[PDB]
Coordinates of C-alpha atoms and ligand atoms in Angstrom, one line a residue:
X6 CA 7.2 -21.0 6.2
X7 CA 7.3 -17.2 5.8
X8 CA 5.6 -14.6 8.2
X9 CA 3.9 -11.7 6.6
X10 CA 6.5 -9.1 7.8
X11 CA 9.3 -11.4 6.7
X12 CA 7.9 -11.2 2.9
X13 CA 9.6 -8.3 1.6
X14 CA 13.0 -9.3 3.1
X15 CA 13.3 -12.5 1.1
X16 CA 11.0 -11.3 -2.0
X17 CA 12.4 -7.8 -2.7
X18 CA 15.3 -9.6 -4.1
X19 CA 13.6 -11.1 -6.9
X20 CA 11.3 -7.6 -8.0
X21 CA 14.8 -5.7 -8.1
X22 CA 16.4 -8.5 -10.1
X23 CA 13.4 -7.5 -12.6
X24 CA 14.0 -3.9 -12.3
X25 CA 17.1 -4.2 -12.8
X26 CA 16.7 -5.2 -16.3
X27 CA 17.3 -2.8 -18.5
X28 CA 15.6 -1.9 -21.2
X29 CA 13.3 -5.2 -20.4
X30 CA 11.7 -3.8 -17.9
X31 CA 10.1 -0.3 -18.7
X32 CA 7.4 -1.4 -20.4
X33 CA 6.0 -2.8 -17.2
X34 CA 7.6 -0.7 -14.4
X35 CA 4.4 1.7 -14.1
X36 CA 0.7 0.6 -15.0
X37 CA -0.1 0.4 -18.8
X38 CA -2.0 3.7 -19.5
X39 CA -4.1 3.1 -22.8
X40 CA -4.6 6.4 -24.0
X41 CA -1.2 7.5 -23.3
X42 CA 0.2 4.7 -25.4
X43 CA -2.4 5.1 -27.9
X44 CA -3.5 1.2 -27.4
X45 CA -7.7 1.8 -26.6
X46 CA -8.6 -1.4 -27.2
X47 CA -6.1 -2.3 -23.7
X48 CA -8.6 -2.7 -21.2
X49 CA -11.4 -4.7 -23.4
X50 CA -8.5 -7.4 -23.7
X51 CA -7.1 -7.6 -20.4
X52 CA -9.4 -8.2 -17.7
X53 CA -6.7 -7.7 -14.7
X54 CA -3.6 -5.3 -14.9
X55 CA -0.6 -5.7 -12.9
X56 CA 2.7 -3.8 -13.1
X57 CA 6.0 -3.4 -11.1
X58 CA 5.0 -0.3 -9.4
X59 CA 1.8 -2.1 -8.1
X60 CA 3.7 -5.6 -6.9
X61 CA 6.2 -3.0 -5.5
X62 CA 4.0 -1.4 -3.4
X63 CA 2.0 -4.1 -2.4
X64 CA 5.3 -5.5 -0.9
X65 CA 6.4 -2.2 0.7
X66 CA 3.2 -2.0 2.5
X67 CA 2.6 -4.9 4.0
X68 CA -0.3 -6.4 1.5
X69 CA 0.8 -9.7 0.8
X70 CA 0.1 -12.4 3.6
X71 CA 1.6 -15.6 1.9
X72 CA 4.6 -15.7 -0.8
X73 CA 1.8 -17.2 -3.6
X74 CA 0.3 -14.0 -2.9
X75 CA 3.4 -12.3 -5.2
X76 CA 4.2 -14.9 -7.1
X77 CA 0.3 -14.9 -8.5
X78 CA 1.0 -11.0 -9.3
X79 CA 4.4 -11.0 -11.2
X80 CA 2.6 -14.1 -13.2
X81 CA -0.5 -12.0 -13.9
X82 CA 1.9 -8.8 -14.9
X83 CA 3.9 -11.7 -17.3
X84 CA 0.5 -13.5 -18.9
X85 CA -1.4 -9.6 -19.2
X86 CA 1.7 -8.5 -21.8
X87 CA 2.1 -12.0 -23.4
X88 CA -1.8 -11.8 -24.1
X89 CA -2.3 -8.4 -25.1
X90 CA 1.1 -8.2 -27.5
X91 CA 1.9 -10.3 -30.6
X92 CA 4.7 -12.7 -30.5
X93 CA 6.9 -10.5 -32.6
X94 CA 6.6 -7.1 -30.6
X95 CA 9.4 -5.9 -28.5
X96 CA 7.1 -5.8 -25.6
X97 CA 6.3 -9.8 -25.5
X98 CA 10.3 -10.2 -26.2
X99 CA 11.0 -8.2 -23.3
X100 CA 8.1 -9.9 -21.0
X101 CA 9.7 -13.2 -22.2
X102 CA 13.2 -12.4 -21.0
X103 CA 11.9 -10.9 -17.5
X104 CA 10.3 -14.2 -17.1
X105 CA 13.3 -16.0 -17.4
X106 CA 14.7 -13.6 -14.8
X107 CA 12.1 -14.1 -12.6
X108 CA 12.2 -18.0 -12.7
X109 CA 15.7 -18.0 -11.6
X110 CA 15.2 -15.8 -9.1
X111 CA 12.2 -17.2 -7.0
X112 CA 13.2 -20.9 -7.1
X113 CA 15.9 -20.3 -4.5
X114 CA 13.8 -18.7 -2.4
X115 CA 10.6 -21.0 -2.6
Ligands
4I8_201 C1 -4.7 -17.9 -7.3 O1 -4.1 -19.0 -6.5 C2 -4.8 -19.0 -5.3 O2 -6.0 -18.7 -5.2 C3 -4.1 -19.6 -4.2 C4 -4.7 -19.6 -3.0 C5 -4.0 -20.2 -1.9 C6 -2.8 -20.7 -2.1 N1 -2.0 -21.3 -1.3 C7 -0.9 -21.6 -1.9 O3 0.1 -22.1 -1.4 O4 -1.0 -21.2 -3.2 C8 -2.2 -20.7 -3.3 C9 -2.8 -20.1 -4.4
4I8_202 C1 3.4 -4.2 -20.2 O1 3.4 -3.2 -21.3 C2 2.6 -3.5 -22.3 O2 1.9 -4.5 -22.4 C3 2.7 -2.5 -23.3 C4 3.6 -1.4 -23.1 C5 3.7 -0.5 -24.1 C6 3.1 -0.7 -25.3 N1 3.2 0.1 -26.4 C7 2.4 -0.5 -27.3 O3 2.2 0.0 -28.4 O4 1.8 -1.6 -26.8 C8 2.3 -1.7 -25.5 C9 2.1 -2.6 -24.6

């Protein structure tokens, strides 16, 4: 059983561990701007954006209640690339190794 103000003690962890992956993560270390990236067809696809920067500050702040609460996040920031990217782009490659990262990482803690 975690407390809410014991969630970013034993979480943080596993965001740096993503983070840390490099160049895997920077795709997905700020929100996915659509014009920017010249991709305008983003937000008809993907219903519910998540990124790093967002799960990051959500844990900094004090947002998250229950561990599920985070977990559900990094799994929406995951599924959102899988979705909107083909199979053969760098960015689903990239989303797939994170994932890996990220399932080592939480079990321990869970
Ligand atoms: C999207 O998932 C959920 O709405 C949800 C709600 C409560 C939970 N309690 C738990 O342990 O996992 C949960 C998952
Ligand atoms: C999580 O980041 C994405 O889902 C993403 C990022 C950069 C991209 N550049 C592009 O052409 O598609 C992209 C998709």
């Amino acid at each position: 059983i975690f407390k809410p103000e014991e969630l970013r003690q034993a979480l943080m962890p596993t965001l740096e561990a993503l983070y840390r992956q490099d160049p895997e993560s920077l795709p997905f270390r700020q929100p996915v701007d659509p014009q920017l990236l010249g991709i305008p067809d983003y937000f008809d696809i993907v219903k519910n954006p998540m990124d790093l920067s967002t799960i990051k500050r959500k844990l900094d702040t004090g947002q998250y209640q229950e561990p599920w609460q985070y977990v559900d996040d990094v799994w929406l920031m995951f599924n959102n690339a899988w979705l909107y990217n083909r199979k053969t782009s760098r960015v689903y490659k990239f989303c797939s190794k994170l994932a890996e990262v990220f399932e080592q990482e939480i079990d321990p803690v869970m």
